[PDB]
Write a protein that binds this DNA or RNA. Sequence first.
RNA 1: GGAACUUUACCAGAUCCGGACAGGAUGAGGAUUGACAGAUUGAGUGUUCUUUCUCGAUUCCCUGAAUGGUGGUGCAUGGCC
Lengths: 59, 212, 115, 54, 91, 60
Amino acid sequence: GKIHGSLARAGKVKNQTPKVAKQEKPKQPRGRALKRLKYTRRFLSKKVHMNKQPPGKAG
Amino acid sequence: GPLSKKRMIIRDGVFYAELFEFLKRELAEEGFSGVSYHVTTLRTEIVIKATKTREVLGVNGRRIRELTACIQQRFNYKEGKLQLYVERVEVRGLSAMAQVESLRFKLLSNLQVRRAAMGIIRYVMESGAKGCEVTVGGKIKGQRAKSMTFRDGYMIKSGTAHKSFVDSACRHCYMRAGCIGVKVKIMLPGDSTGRNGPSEPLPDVITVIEPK
Amino acid sequence: EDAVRIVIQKALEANGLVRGLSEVARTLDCKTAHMCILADDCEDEEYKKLVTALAKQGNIDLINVEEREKLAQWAGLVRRDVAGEVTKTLKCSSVAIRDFGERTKALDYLLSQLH
Amino acid sequence: LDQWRSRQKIGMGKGARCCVICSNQKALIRKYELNVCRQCFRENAEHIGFTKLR
Amino acid sequence: MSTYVPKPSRDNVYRFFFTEGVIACKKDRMGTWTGTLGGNTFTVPCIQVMQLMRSLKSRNLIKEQYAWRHYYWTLNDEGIAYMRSYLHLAP
Amino acid sequence: PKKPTHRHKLEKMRALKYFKVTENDDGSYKVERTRQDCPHPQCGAGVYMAQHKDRQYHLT
RNA sequence: GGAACUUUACCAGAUCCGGACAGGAUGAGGAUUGACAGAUUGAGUGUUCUUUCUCGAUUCCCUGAAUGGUGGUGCAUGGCC
Ligand SMILES: [Mg+2]
Ligand SMILES: [Mg+2]
């Protein structure tokens, strides 16, 4: 038919999302010490890619 | 039963065609550049042209020793009949077969496609070549494939004389996302002895001589 | 029993060893195996000693060692790790040899051994 | 049981023959007892020695 | 045939493969392989030589390259040192 | 309609194939056999025949 | 691409592993291979069930994997046309 969506299909993708849970991951420092952690990695530990990702299916 | 002379030119061509494929697969990172085999009584010669003669030869000839007996066990030669040699290409910049295998490794080591291809053409054109043309085709940028060509100098393409003057070789680069094919065409400059290039000039160059 | 250890790893080098119930029982009927060893202790089939029949009837030499499990730990018939020791040991009770030799087999002709 | 390749043991057919380069048994050139596949020959005509003159 | 390789064949193929260093075997799965220790008497089927070498390469002991219809297998530095232990030879 | 079994080889329980009586062996006799060989097909040395209703068995 | 079988990709069945190599439990006091006669079967096909001998560590049983495909997508590509 002309329309392929319905009100009955509401929340289709969010229901069938496989429901992964977050992992443990101990807390980062907060406040002034988190700015210390930002500064030491992007400056003291030497384009600059802030989030370089490992190679995937694009190459 | 003996074969006819028509039946022996066939099996001598399929000999060279199979010998060429084996060494193209083996000696790709040794900078392989061709074979000439000379047959006579008491011995069959095979001369291998390469760019890396310390590597196609082993530490004591170990690599060519294994590479000898691979040809011996396949084609059923006897002991003493088959001897192999390695000669090096004198220029390395006029051999299109060597340069395309290096350009294969410049991409497989995750360098940029255009930086790699101009590194060939700078090296080929400084080595006395009259012209060069590198074509990289495949998924260069993303999901959909492109084609780029990179050019410098002369290039004869329409004649049947381009078999004499233009050296060509095409290989495949097996990326993580797909397959890229690279081509390298080099127009041979000179070398009237036939070291690299024909003796005679180009078919349309007239070059009137000056009087005494 | 320690001189028996050296003579059988020279036997697994060539060629040629028969181990167990076995066709070793078949080659002693043929009397082809030159020398054998087996268990001295009693095990399954009450240590039936048909090998003690089939050796001496075929004029074949015979040697008894007490430990029938861990009989040939040198020969490596048991699982390896390969970091640590061997695991739980299988039978390997009777071993027939037709092999070399040439190092301590001259010492194996001591004690007026069956001839 | 070793009925295993009993039809491929007898070698009379189009399945007994094969491209010597390219392992295929479809459209092979058997002229001059060459036994190369159609497509795998044009890649290898220059090394066998064939050049297209006309 | 069968990839079930008998023990007198496996050490006989390994005796050739340590001596010459290389084995070239056609991909024909109904044909034999012939090697030589002076007597040229192996007549091993090609099905079994593929199985022996596919077990070796999975244990990363050999280097395999494949031409038109022939395999070409070569021993490594670890592979020669491994092959000497199976045949029990002096270095 | 029903799946077959994919037969494994049966274990003989501490005897593949067997000899005869009087295991004392007091220097008088070799032990007798319990089947025959019928040799040169093909080996005949340690080839021992089956009973199979006392018929025969390899081959030889 | 003039296919009787093969080719072969399709349909009704039947075998075989060509599931390497690891890790774990059976294992030489046997891991397992193969098969004569019958029954099974389209099959004087040991495929399997009965029968018992052969093979002698190659295997097999679990777990993780890997290699094969004339499977898909030519609108992911190389190459050739
Ligand atoms: Mg040399
Ligand atoms: Mg003909």
